[PDB]
Amino acid sequence: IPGIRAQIRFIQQVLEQREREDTFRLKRIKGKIEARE
Amino acid sequence: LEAQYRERERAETEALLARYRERAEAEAKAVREKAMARLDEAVALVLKEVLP
Amino acid sequence: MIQGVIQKIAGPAVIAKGMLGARMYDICKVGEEGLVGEIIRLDGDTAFVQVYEDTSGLKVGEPVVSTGLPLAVELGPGMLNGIYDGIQRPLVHALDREKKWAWTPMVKPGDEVRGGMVLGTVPEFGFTHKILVPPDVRGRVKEVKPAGEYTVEEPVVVLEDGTELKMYHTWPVRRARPVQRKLDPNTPFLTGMRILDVLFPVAMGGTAAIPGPFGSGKTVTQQSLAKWSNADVVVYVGCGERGNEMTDVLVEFPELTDPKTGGPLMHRTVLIANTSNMPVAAREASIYVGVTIAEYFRDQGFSVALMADSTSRWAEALREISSRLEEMPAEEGYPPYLAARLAAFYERAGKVITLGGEEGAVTIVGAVSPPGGDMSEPVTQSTLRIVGAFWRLDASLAFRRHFPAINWNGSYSLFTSALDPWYRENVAEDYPELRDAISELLQREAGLQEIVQLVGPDALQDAERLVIEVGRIIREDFLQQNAYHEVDAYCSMKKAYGIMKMILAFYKEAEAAIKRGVSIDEILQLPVLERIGRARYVSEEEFPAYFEEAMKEIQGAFKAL
Amino acid sequence: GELLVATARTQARGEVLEEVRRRVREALEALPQKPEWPEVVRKLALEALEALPGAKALVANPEDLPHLEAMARERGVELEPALRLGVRAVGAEGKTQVENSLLARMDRAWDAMSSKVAQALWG
Amino acid sequence: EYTGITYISGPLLFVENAKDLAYGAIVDIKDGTGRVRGGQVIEVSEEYAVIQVFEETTGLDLATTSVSLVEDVARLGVSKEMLGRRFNGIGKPIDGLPPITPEKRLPITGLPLNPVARRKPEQFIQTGISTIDVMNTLVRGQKLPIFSGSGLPANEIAAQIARQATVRPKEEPFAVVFAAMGITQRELSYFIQEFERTGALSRSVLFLNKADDPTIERILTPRMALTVAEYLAFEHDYHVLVILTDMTNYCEALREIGAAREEIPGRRGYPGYMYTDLATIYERAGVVEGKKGSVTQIPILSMPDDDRTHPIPDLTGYITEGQIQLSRELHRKGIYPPIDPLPSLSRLMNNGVGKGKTREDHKQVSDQLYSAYANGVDIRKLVAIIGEDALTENDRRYLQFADAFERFFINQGQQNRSIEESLQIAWALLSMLPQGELKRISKDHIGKYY
């Protein structure tokens, strides 16, 4: 059961990894289009 | 045994280098003197390529 | 100033050119230095040119000349055995001007012809090249050469009293070659690989994407297909080359053999390199040059395979050209225009009824290389939306030594139903039912393993342990294939179904034995199991004998009870 | 000790190159205080207009002037900026900038033929 | 010919010329500076103005400041005498010795020589490390990355290979080119001392780029190194091993300027051109024409934030023939070298193994060890799920095999294992498994070698 929270925890952080950082290469690209224009 | 092995290398890592010092500088002298007589020929080759 | 121009400015990768008044949009232009470029922007007072190479070799005042071709390609005798690049040219001309070809007249003066009609034949390379009336040309054959020897530039025929025809023709790589109709996906492209042919079929003239991270085995699927697929000709666009992937293919493939004949595979191949030192323009045009050559061979009545290493790198080369042209960047800075273009490419795939009857086809297998596992844009995203087939090499399946490393849970062939009848009529009546049953097995295993990950495997009933036992045999004895073994490197259709029936028959017997209180431990160490495990290595039907060997062995287990 | 030799040759080999250069530059520095210097000065300025640039004018020390009013009278004209042993040129109003100097051209030589001079010295 | 600065924004400087425009790629020199300041022409803007990129800081530049055109790009002072010297990223001496006396002056972008043959990598390079030589053999012409992360001893491995590598009886001489990028002064002093003390320096050219050296000098470093390697291999017929640490640091510098260059950023803030610049480096490897020499690469790819999916390390995988991936988790368990045995591969491995190369059972043994280790590692997860006592007898053997593989095969007490030694350890550990469970070893090999 603390197996659940365990490896499955790795789960939430590859998940979370994936995008507050991915979602950001992006708010900033679009800036970048007419941010650059 | 180490006592007579460590002092072996030191009495060679002095003689060997100390010999290189005789070799190195004699080969320094040996590169200068070949250059310093057949030299104006070099100066000539250069000058002749700057004033064109 | 109609046919030539002079560089106004260069830097930032775009050459601005004064003149070139008759140049077409997307035509290749030639700089005096020998570099090529593509006309991208036509403006009232200049032409903007994308340079396919280093722009320091271009200076203001330099002369620029039209080529007249869309980016064009030459299509005639001399294509086979040839090695070109992104914009077709010896690894410069395209087709030998000196080489003599034996032209055989296949039309008489007075015959009425239309674009695609066959007027002559040339045994340029066995293959027999088929000389066709260029698309958009029809009328009456007023003059035609007799059976002799001629160079490409020579005129072999005149139509409508003066259009002159040669053995070759030019075509804009950017424009898909015309055809009467596209036929519906009906015939499978027999790969010889069990997982593909069975679960994720590719149809002759189908578009099936190959996608996954770097080093998952994407190219290898393509190369095995060429060594063994049922296409007569292969058009390999070995793009995204780097470090030495160019020299890796330069003197290597010239030695690779045709498993079918025992002759060089290059003897039925056309290579189209896309190296890093090449302009974004050339690599962009490479898929169009290849597809056109591919369409050319299918016109003869051949089934050709077009393997595109890869489109991720082609979209990066295109984004470089677009940004240099100052086109507005979107998602990941890619231009808006890409999705329609990429789709237009894959649309040129298909099995057709060629001009003058006869059937041929171009099957496309495209490599997918996302920036890094993200599997979004460019490549993957847009591609997986077009293609009908996707074979997902799985790095975890590879690390586990399960070959081919194709994920039977994440892969899909919209083509399964499209090709099932070919298998049912020519190989086995139970092909579809067998692959559906194996997939349900694998599907059930996946669900079971998820639960076991939580509550452990100790509570597992015998019925669930049996399903994992057989599921494992499917993975190890079927899904996994050894590309390095002289036998298992290729698995004929006949062998694929026979191995499937041995596994499925072992399953039924396994579930039947359990239902009669036979210990699973007794079945797990059944002697036939080790033979089923080495079945992929047998090159004789001795494999279907395993079915009877399985049944009697279970009987010996029904005996002991 | 083997390294102890190569470097001691390198220092020696250096000293000789650095003396061959010392002299080569002494020659040019004391070049103006001899004849055949005027024929040198003009021939430099010739290439300035003879090269890519369109014609306009050139400049030098005020002692290159006694030896530089020839094509000055042929619609060009001479002008110290301390030109030392060289002559700048102006191709137009848009400067263009072409400079033909003996020091500047020496430096484009001590690297062009670094081997040849060594080849003449030792080999 | 001389020009004048008309604009300065960070690394980008515009320069107007009244006569003769310098062509793209030419090196220009800024006048009036204490240290040499190079501007590389990038574009012709029109109106006699070019746009350039500085190779060092632009602080203190003024509009109107003078600039001269050198008449050419940048270059390598090529000579066999490059061996035994330590240089900067730009090829300037760092060892207090005189500047190189060139036999030829070569452009560095990869255009010079056209050295490569269209032949496959082949034949052995003995690194002296068992986990490479035995299980993931490096071959002449291959690109075999070291895949690591921050805190791991990737540089110790790189330095050890530099000291130890050879081409066992080859008629051709062997050389090392070692290039370091964005390293500290302490690291530079350490690398220098190591090459000098061991006598590894005698057969090596070393290029060192410091963290505080110009970003442009870092970009040029791998190009100086690859050009020297191609020269030695092609013109002198040598088998050359090039070691490049760290490609991720090279990428941080290239990425740093992409912004100043006006590009729309790609994923993770990287340059949109990441893969086609990186391709200019990984394309430069393989057998050279004549087949007397070859260029082999061992690039170090550290995971930023330990993420092997970051675009930099992820795009590097395709440029390699062998990959050695290091893992922090493994290092924290005290297993060194901290190689992930289920993520290290050999792309061209099959070309350097078997009868007449290593031994006939090499592929079978490698396949079986890889399969058993991967199963054993998964079973470590299963043990955590169910408990050790609930594991089957068969699974317990695979669990134990994973420990044996790590303790005995991966771990070497620094020690030069022959392929025969490595196969022997492999067979010894394989004995732990039931013979009936050796699915990937044909019976012919079991009888002959077990």
Ligand SMILES: Nc1ncnc2c1ncn2[C@@H]1O[C@H](COP(=O)(O)OP(=O)(O)O)[C@@H](O)[C@H]1O
């Ligand atoms: N079918 C396969 N069998 C075994 N190893 C494979 C297979 N496919 C890929 N690999 C491993 O992955 C490496 C990279 O595969 P590749 O197809 O070249 O990658 P990519 O998907 O980037 O094209 C191969 O050199 C090999 O080591």
